[PDB]
C-alpha atoms as an extended CHARMM CRD file, in Angstrom:
* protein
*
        22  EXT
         1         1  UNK       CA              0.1550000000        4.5350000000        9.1320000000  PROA      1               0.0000000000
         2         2  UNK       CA             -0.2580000000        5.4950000000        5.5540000000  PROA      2               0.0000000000
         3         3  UNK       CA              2.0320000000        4.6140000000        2.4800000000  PROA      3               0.0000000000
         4         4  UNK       CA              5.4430000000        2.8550000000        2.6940000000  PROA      4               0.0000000000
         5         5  UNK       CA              6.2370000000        6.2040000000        4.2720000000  PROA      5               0.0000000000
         6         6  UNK       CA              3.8570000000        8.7090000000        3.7470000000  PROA      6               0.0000000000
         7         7  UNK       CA              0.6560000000       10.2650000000        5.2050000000  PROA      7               0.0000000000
         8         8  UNK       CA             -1.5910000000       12.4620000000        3.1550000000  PROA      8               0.0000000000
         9         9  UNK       CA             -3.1520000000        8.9910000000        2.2060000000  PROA      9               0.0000000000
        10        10  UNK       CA             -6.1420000000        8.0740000000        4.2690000000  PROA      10              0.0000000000
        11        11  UNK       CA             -7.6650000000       10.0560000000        7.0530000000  PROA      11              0.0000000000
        12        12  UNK       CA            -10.9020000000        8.2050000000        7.8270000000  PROA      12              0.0000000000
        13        13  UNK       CA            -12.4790000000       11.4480000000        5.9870000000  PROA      13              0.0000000000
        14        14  UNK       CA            -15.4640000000       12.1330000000        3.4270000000  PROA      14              0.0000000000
        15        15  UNK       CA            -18.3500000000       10.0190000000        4.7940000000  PROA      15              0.0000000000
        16        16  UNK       CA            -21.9730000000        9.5680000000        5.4270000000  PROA      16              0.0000000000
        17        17  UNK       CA            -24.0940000000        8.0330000000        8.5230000000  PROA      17              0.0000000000
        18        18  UNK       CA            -27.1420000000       10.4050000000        8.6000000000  PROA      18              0.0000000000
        19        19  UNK       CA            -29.3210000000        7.1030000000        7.3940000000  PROA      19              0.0000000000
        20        20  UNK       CA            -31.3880000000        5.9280000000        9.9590000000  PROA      20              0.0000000000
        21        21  UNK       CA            -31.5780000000        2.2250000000       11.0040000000  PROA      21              0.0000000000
        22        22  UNK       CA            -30.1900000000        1.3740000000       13.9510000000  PROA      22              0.0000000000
């Protein structure tokens, strides 16, 4: 779901897990 009625809103996109720590 994304806006009262939308959807170009959120996507889950544009991120970074390359560090190491786990």
């Amino acid at each position: 779901m994304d806006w009262g009625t939308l959807q170009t809103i959120l996507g889950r996109v544009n991120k970074h897990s390359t560090s190491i720590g786990k």
